[PDB]
Amino acid sequence: NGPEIMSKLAGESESNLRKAFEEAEKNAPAIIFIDELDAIAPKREKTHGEVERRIVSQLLTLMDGLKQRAHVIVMAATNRPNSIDPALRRFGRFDREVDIGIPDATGRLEILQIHTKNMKLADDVDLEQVANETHGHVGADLAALCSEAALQAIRKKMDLIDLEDETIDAEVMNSLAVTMDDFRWALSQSNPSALRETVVEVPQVTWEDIGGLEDVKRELQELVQYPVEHPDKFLKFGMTPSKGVLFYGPPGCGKTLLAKAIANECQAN
Amino acid sequence: VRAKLDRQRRVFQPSPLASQFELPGDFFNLTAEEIKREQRLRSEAVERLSVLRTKAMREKEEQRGLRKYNYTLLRVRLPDGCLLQGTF
Ligand SMILES: Nc1ncnc2c1ncn2[C@@H]1O[C@H](COP(=O)(O)OP(=O)(O)O)[C@@H](O)[C@H]1O
The missing domain is CATH 3.40.50.300 (P-loop containing nucleotide triphosphate hydrolases)
Incomplete structure (x- = not known):
């Protein structure tokens, strides 16, 4: 180092x-x-x-x-x-x-599952919901998040049961489950270490999120999908695919969703 | 028409034997119940100061502890060692 x-x-x-x-x-x-x-x-x-x-x-x-x-x-x-x-x-x-x-939302869920391999979770625990809320967090923060949730669950139950000794009963530890309330508390204590850096991921916006614009949806598919779904037709006619498109018009009409939705269907970042 | 409050005058003589009590050696060894209770109270003391809430939410918490008493029992310590008690 x-x-x-x-x-x-x-x-x-x-x-x-x-x-x-x-x-x-x-x-x-x-x-x-x-x-x-x-x-x-x-x-x-x-x-x-x-x-x-x-x-x-x-x-x-x-x-x-x-x-x-x-x-x-x-x-x-x-x-x-x-x-x-x-x-x-x-x-x-x-x-x-x-x-x-x-990590993106999927990666964050995987990390939470890894650091809970040994943890007994209650039926109300939803790690996917946690992964969606932990924007800007990295593995070090999700590991600390699980650790804090474990400590809160241990203080609620085990501190009333455990001895002032070196060892604890296996049954007492195995009988402890971590609830969703303990994850929510831990989320309030955790602070993302990488919130300002740009996050690049496949968006969750789909075509079903955009009302109207039926022709624009098709136009984006022609510009983005066809050059790689049908490359033999572009070569046949000697065409060079367009490198991009500009949108113009009034604000608040869905320009952001259009760019994300085509990335979503294409599974592109 | 309302009933008059009876003072129920009583006088007591304290006995020196009332203060003679010896503790076991294990008295000062804190239990798991005391450790979990006190650790919860420490976290609640920090959370109580940390929460953002209006006066109405503060009244809901405080209000639960305010209404139990409407009578009092008074005692008077007299120079001659007598303990005089009555109801008001
Ligand atoms: N065609 C549409 N279908 C569904 N929602 C839309 C549409 N157009 C705009 N919106 C809503 O308006 C908001 C703003 O869209 P956006 O494209 O981000 O506008 P701008 O980029 O000008 O701020 C979006 O969050 C979306 O919910």
């Missing part, structure tokens, strides 16, 4: 970073994970400190040495893809990138 390597003195941060790569080779196959990549290897042209520029050169050479260190893969995490020195992105080194982003 960046902060730990940066806490080391000049000469120690470079040696310690190299040792990590040497140990991974000795234990190969191995995976090296570098957290806060933007902290360990910030853009060199942005930092005047000699040590912070040096550690970038040291990481770049260690990454290149992976052609000799057999069966070692280096993974890294950053909060922003543009906060790291672009040299790392050259062929080799970090030439694969995956955008994790923010």
Whole structure:
């Protein structure tokens, strides 16, 4: 992790970073994970400190040495893809990138189900309703949400039953169910850690949500679906599909729903 | 026509034996009932101050505790050690 390597003195941060790569080779196959990549290897042209520029050169050479260190893969995490020195992105080194982003409503429900595997839920619990309300939340927040719901259910029942000892009866714990009221309370305490970042997901607006505009609905299908549903007809006539359409007219007539509804039927983000 | 309130005058002599009571060693070990009750009251004290509500909702909570009494029993502590009681 960046902060730990940066806490080391000049000469120690470079040696310690190299040792990590040497140990991974000795234990190969191995995976090296570098957290806060933007902290360990910030853009060199942005930092005047000699040590912070040096550690970038040291990481770049260690990454290149992976052609000799057999069966070692280096993974890294950053909060922003543009906060790291672009040299790392050259062929080799970090030439694969995956955008994790923010889970959508379906992903949020899956996370809630995962962190409740061991939890007994009451019949009134509706995790889909929770996932729909938790806008702007990420897995760390949904995990905390389940934890807080567990603690509230435990305080209501178990604190009246449990002993001042190291162990608790298995029957008492197994007989505790977490109700929807405990999730609602936990939702009031939780605060999303990623509310401002743009969320990209398949919209839930369908054609049934739009009154009228029967011809516009068909026009969007011709512009968006036909180029990929019938590509042989576009090639046959030498046509280049349109790249987009502009809507104009009075406000409040459904322009937003039209764009979402076509994305919905196409299952597009 | 209304009945007159009878003072029911009584005088008592306290006995030194009334204050002689020794606790068991386990008296000061808090129970699960006390831990769950007190932990609930701590959360309710924070929630009560945190809730946004009009005066009518505040009156509904306070009003339930206000109406029980319309008589009083008075005592007077006299220099000679006698306890004088009556009804008003
Ligand atoms: N054709 C329509 N069918 C159903 N609802 C509509 C229609 N046109 C507008 N609305 C309602 O009006 C609101 C505003 O639509 P929107 O396209 O967002 O307008 P604007 O983008 O100008 O603010 C929507 O929330 C929708 O509920």
